[model samples]
Target: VNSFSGYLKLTDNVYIKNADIVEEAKKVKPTVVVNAANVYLKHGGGVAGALNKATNNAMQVESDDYIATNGPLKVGGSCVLSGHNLAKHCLHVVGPNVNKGEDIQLLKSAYENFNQHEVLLAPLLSAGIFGADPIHSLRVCVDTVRTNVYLAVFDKNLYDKLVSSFL
Candidate 1:
């Protein structure tokens, strides 16, 4: 347990956290975090907003620039933005507007866009503003991720449930 947060070891490099995603992003510095982004770079709410704000809206500018010429990626498609903000780099995965629930297959498709690495990290998709269960999100995230990574979640209860079957 880091005092700042506790984690579940899915593998040595991979981890799950039931803590503040904003705070977690800070701790996971240098490890590029994923931003569930729209092609237009309109990341206005939830954890994306926090991440955008934390990075001083640099990603917005970057993604804004990215979408200008390129524009919109497929469900699983992603584009990399230079490390600015709180993260060292940004792996921008294109996904749907998470107002209610997310399409699991599509979200999983988005997760696969990242390059294989030892310490990938991101806030749970659809779990924050979307109010989707972090556990469900993790199931897809864990399954889709080919290598180890870290996760940010808002609810501790979901964390308990996730850690239960594993521990």
Candidate 2:
């Protein structure tokens, strides 16, 4: 089984857990699932790819249409997409790429862009292929998220590391 633990609460609304987001998503049915999107907003890999699959690929269609209309999103920019699945909607946010020496402010902006919602399922933005250090990413997330949040961590090592600082 995929490990799921670290039920720590940062506030009345913020919760963190070590679980596969795609699996937990089936149960929580969040108001919105935050996708760590590319600037082009393609849902081809990682968190974005998984969410596209979870939404039966309808989200990808919505995303493609969005990019076609709105042009590629800049780092730290965001837009909404129809979920067409478990989530009521999806928020696609582009994070700063550390490899490019992009300003971390973009990461903060991505987190701040979420509109008020009941439940938000979020990954550690910029912590994956974008090359952000996990701790900084977690800090950005924890500081900015105000809604009820389920911070999903896929790997046990990252989960453990986060739990250490979260508590």
Candidate 3:
């Protein structure tokens, strides 16, 4: 459980976990969790898919007005999912195109904006079906958020890897 060189300010239970995000969410009870996405704010894909499914796709319904009113959801921007389980908001980011730079800054803003009252989620900006480097995925997260947050890694090995390498 580390923010890597004092870059993170998280509690023990919230850091370095192989826990279920939605499961642990029952306890942390953040107002929002970060989700990686585009300016469209579509909840049918990527991290959006899981959150959409969990909340009965209500996140999409909740975001419709925000998108319609504000336009193009931008890199670090976010929206709230009113009256939903898990969290009240989701900081949606555009992500690091090559598993680097922009991805870090993108999530940094997202996490900061949604923070304390939020979770600097182990969102794995890529690295699964997207095949991004798992190592860098963790790096991007820690590099951005040095404040209050949660380390939600569902995969035990990956969680161990992050712990061994960073913590």
Candidate 4:
């Protein structure tokens, strides 16, 4: 198991942790990694960029095809894409852009819309360029995501804040 700094039990089957998302997902094997994606589903920046880079840009092409087939994803919506070497699949979730005047409910809805899976890896949605307060986004993630999932976080300060929330 990857070293996790904080743990919050949400249900017998669901929990949250402050850990490295990609590394944890790799160890878990055959899990779904959730991407903090935009409406356009472009894997260009933030968590999307990292995941896309890990997959050698294959996910970008898959995302483009997904958009071409389904049109732009609405805020709070998500769709699945085939994963590469690290995972079996990836869930692309379009979170509300607070900087664009979107609110918390949309963020809640994004978490609520995840497809059923035994294990999923997720990031703190809206906490990056979307302009969400990371702590608030972390709380939302803790309270929302219902599956057996890991809240993989990158920033040490954010991880400390997450651990603090449990104390």
Candidate 5:
């Protein structure tokens, strides 16, 4: 089994994986959610292989549109991503395993779509550890596009310090 542990600080309201989407909505009350998913091909082609078999799906659901559930919703043995409907729309990203470099490429494509004039919210770089390397994943994600990015973390102490340092 895979396990993740870390801490982060948020200067502003941000969205991220492994976070309580419903609680976040009660706190920030965002306007839209954009779910992002990545599509991958197998070594021999087609989407039927070990790498392509284990898929990672990430969703950015709006708080208003989200329906709270006791547990995660399962689909094809995967969880159906959702939130507290905090935003207008959500971006769900279903990607293949990142053992190779293809995961980064797929993420870049997803980031490109966020190049709109609106500010983008994200969690701290460490949060990606649950899926990928935090630094590498976040850096590549930020470098792939030029939209304004906001990151949030789960550590309240760290969050306090981060905000104080900015002042």
Candidate 6:
């Protein structure tokens, strides 16, 4: 986890294990919150996929300034091409399916411009390239963004790690 304090780390595991997510988050009092949606599903069913789907829906709702896909990586739908585009302002990066030394560098560059005040919302799956196991993914994500970061996971063990490490 990031060495910094006061950053809140959240995981979906608490909810899945019947632990108190609200209470835990209340206890942390995070300045910024990161969360994942549509958790506990198979390979294609998780936060990163959900975010892609949501972004797709949002594009359908308002197609302006949304480019389906422009990067070397193949995200199923069009994404915003320019930073000026409000719809495109949100950056979604798909992590490697396996661990690669380059992934760490890529993550650093992706988030390099992010300030401490910015709430980086991402799914465990995006950072889970090292392993699909939630606990490991949480650790990798937290360690990757060592400055100011918030992580969310659907596994309880992962949540406990986040709490102990950050909260």
- Residue 87 of model 3 has an lDDT of 56
Model 1 segments more than 4 A misplaced? 1-5, 11-13, 96-103, 130-133, 165-167
Residue range 1-167, candidate 4, lDDT tens digits: 53333566645544566666766666665567888899898777788888888878888888888889889998998888887766788888888988889876888888776546656778878888889887777666657766666677777777777677652
Highest-TM-score candidate: 2
Instruction: List clashing residue pairs in candidate 2.
Output: none
- Candidate 4 at 136: error in angstroms? 1.7
What ordering of candidates by TM-score runs from best to worst? 2, 4, 1, 3, 5, 6
- Cα lDDT of model 2 by residue, 1-167, tens digit: 11224567767666778888787776767778788888898788888888888888888888888878989998998887875675677788888878779898888888887646656788888987778997898888778877667788889898888878764
TM-score of each: 0.79, 0.88, 0.69, 0.85, 0.44, 0.42
Tens digits of lDDT, candidate 6, 13-57:
211121332233334444333322111111143443343344444
| Least well predicted 10-residue stretch by lDDT in candidate 1 | 95-104
Name the runs in model 3 displaced over 4 angstroms: 1-14, 80-83, 97-122, 126-131
Per-residue CA lDDT of model 1 for 1-167, tens digit only, reads 33234666776545877777667767656467777665556778776777788778876787777777886766557777775746667777765445634465577777677545546677666565555556666777777776666776666776677778653
The best candidate by lDDT is 2
Model 1 TM-score, all chains together: 0.79
Q: Model 4 clash tally?
A: 0
For every model shown, the clashing-pair count is: 2, 0, 2, 0, 27, 9
Show where candidate 2 strays beyond 4 Å.
1-6
Clash pairs detected, candidate 4:
none
Clash pairs, candidate 1, are 55-85, 83-88
Q: Candidate 1 or 6, higher lDDT?
A: 1
In candidate 1, residue 13 scores what lDDT? 49
Residues 51-167 of candidate 3 have per-residue lDDT tens digits of 667878777886777788888765666554452776555666555444334454454455444344534544666545444576776665566555555666667888677777764
lDDT of each: 0.67, 0.78, 0.58, 0.75, 0.36, 0.36
For candidate 5, what is the lDDT?
0.36
Candidate 5 wrongly placed segments (more than 4 Å): 1-22, 34-84, 99-102, 123-130, 154-167
Model 6 clash pairs are 11-153, 12-153, 13-155, 67-78, 67-79, 68-77, 68-78, 68-79, 69-78
